[PDB]
Design a protein around this ligand. Structure first.
Ligand SMILES: N[C@](CCCC[B-](O)(O)O)(CCN1CCCCC1)C(=O)O
Ligand SMILES: N[C@](CCCC[B-](O)(O)O)(CCN1CCCCC1)C(=O)O
Ligand SMILES: N[C@](CCCC[B-](O)(O)O)(CCN1CCCCC1)C(=O)O
Ligand SMILES: [Mn+2]
Ligand SMILES: [Mn+2]
Ligand SMILES: [Mn+2]
Ligand SMILES: [Mn+2]
Ligand SMILES: [Mn+2]
Ligand SMILES: [Mn+2]
Lengths: 314, 314, 314
């Protein structure tokens, strides 16, 4: 049975806009925990993380808020490892995507053999040196990849980081706004990716087959799904900081997560970048939160074909 | 040549909301009959059915308005059988989906070998015992299936019903909100279905190929298409009683119906659950009615590639 | 390297509505030339064409503004041939689609072996005799096809036209509103087409593979892409004169143009039928222009997976 440990991560300093901190709150108030319980799920809530203010946090070169971002991820890694040791699937409610450094790092402490599926409009693989924005939510993958050690400078706040995945252990789905440095890294390291071009070419059906065969073909292993809500088209998730048109549909989002659930190997989940304050209308917030909840429920067994308990309904 | 008998079925008591009775009216005022004539069609209008008021209709256990629903379907079955005996394709304008009991039953009197394609967000296969709503528009398939006789109680109003299809004679397309009891029946009886998950997996092209091969592979036979407008996404058909997000697109809807037309075997058609009173704006009503008309026109030969008469246009 | 010659064609008299003349202006003000320069491109601007007023232009039978349309295309053919002789890809900003007579004709003077890809909701293949509207933007293909000479009357303004393509040298993508005479011609001449039905059936991936294999399988040759913005769904390009629902998505539009870019054979491009005055809101205009610019940028190398210069980014 599929058993979850919920971790709230109200953190925003990996990017400029403030409202992403309210991510955990609006998802919970949408009745996420209750809805999980209403399906097959054993849910334990490990609460929202207290991220202390680090008021003295001047840029490292162009990299903004490095100490705050680093500490938040350090804290999150500790909590994720704790929930994993308790035999539960970690469900991190973000919060900006810089937290993926902490989420994946903590997960990997307990399950070093994890494979990562990254659903996003962006690769989030800028280094502190290639970034032109300095926003750390556009950099987390570079901190995790072994191949890029010695390319990442000693950024204050990140001394605790030990890269825990290789180029072969991650697959991107949804990419349509990739920086030139990022594209260079992508091609250089030979990372498997399905940009929107590939999804258009192959269909999401083949994308998922290829994705799961790629990661699980050799050996079954724990899956970490890091889901940036901006992976989906802004017509479905508008209340987010860096929306890009031409995204994955609602249907494609549910297909990805249904197929992932059915492997029985989902081990860690990030639901990131929901910013209710960026909704142009109340309905836009509602639509974004509703979609994020739907995505989450699919990850833990809710199937569009229907679900039933193991009894005779007739 | 493709020859039609139109039957209006202004009936609503299979569900709570009243405006679905206006279905026939708004479709006709959209110029449906004229547009059919403007393509290849021989159209006879058998008028709107007069459904008498049965004011004494207390629930049967939780099942609501059983006598009214039963009589409406009994009447409709008689009219459908009449149009079929006249060598015409019955076109039923609904009205709520409980009327499918009458439509399919009457059709099957004349053509017992029919196969059913059911386009819907829902399976509509609750029994009077499994339903939690009591709304009969969520139950019609259970009354039609031979396998489920002895599971259906003697509901007042339905003594005339004799189940006329087996589990193998129906294919669902579009399913994304299926009750647990319904999912149990679906899996137990081995009914062929393409939920939105399958449509996402395979593409509507393969779905239609599989659907038609399934029903027609052994032997050519009459097709009954029961089309709930909520099968399509609410972005296309919002003025309907039980909308569910993540539906079939407009394009997928036309593809389904184009492919069905081209078999030359369409024998019965239901266009159900249009409720103009549920449109949030006049445009939403217009959009819903326009889409329903477009779907209908495709069923009778209107092709997106173009149509032409058998002459030399040059 | 991919090298462009921009030609503004502010012309509207191939159809009734006036604002399409502002096409070049709003695309340029959207920063199109700058954005092309911001990617790999050598851009020369050959300016906007001065189309003299021909006030004496009474209908030829039902065909409207024949002399004005004919002269505009004659002028455009001269400019396109000039840019082609200069070793550049002609980029024509329309303007209504009647200008395709001039664009393709001029291109073909320099590269007689061109193949045409026509992205549109319409076939634009009515002759002056089959048209029921008389609008010349619905007729340009008939003037270009060799097979139809002797079917085209001596329309004033078009004596300069010499048909330059055969039935085999054109592929349509996007068709969903085709007149009966047009469908007759399509089927009679055996022209390759992918209506929305085929796109639904096969997926845009297979459509592009088949399209390019069809045109380029035997021999590599220059490609002319004539892109009517109404090929895309009106949810993406609403500010256009003849919108039709159920169109190609934004994603499909970018996939078509990405795949075309990657052949290295794009030789001529038309971006047609943008009419800012038909936007119901400022945002609709913006959305239409934004989409058209995005389509154009994809034709000249902008890839959703990312782009990078030939250096070491690390
Ligand atoms: N690549 C960006 C966006 C990162 C998004 C983070 B994610 O996916 O968690 O939301 C954007 C860089 N871009 C450079 C030029 C254009 C504007 C900013 C960056 O800041 O590095
Ligand atoms: N399955 C439902 C909806 C039926 C829709 C009828 B159709 O497709 O003609 O429109 C809904 C049951 N559901 C149970 C719990 C949630 C709310 C109601 C039911 O009432 O049985
Ligand atoms: N086929 C039409 C539309 C042409 C669109 C031109 B394009 O693709 O550049 O935008 C429409 C003919 N139709 C006949 C009956 C219905 C209304 C007009 C025509 O005018 O010939
Ligand atoms: Mn992102
Ligand atoms: Mn991200
Ligand atoms: Mn339904
Ligand atoms: Mn139904
Ligand atoms: Mn057009
Ligand atoms: Mn056109």
């Amino acid at each position: 049975s599929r058993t979850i440990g919920i971790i709230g991560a109200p953190f925003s300093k990996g990017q400029p806009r403030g409202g992403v901190e309210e991510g955990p709150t609006v998802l919970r108030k949408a009745g996420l925990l209750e809805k999980l319980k209403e399906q097959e799920c054993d849910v334990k809530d490990y609460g929202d993380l207290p991220f202390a203010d680090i008021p003295n946090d001047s840029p490292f070169q162009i990299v903004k808020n490095p100490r705050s971002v680093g500490k938040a991820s350090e804290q999150l890694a500790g909590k994720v490892a704790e929930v994993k040791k308790n035999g539960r699937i970690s469900l991190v409610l973000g919060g900006d995507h810089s937290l993926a450094i902490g989420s994946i790092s903590g997960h990997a402490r307990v399950h070093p053999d994890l494979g990562v599926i990254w659903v996003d409009a962006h690769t989030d693989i800028n280094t502190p040196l290639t970034t032109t924005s300095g926003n750390l939510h556009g950099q987390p993958v570079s901190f995790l990849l072994k191949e890029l050690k010695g390319k990442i400078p000693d950024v204050p706040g990140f001394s605790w980081v030990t890269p825990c995945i290789s180029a072969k252990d991650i697959v991107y789905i949804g990419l349509r706004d990739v920086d030139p440095g990022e594209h260079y890294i992508l091609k250089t390291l030979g990372i498997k990716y399905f940009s929107m071009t590939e999804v258009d070419r192959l269909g999401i059906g083949k994308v998922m087959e290829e994705t799961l065969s790629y990661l699980l073909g050799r050996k079954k292993r724990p899956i970490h799904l890091s889901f940036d809500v901006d992976g989906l088209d802004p017509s479905f998730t508008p209340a987010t900081g860096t929306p890009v048109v031409g995204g994955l549909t609602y249907r494609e989002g549910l297909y990805i997560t249904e197929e992932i659930y059915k492997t029985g190997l989902l081990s860690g989940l990030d639901i990131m970048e929901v910013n209710p304050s960026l909704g142009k209308t109340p309905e836009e917030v509602t639509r974004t939160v509703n979609t994020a909840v739907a995505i989450t429920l699919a990850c833990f067994g809710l199937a569009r074909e229907g679900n039933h308990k193991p009894i005779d309904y007739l």
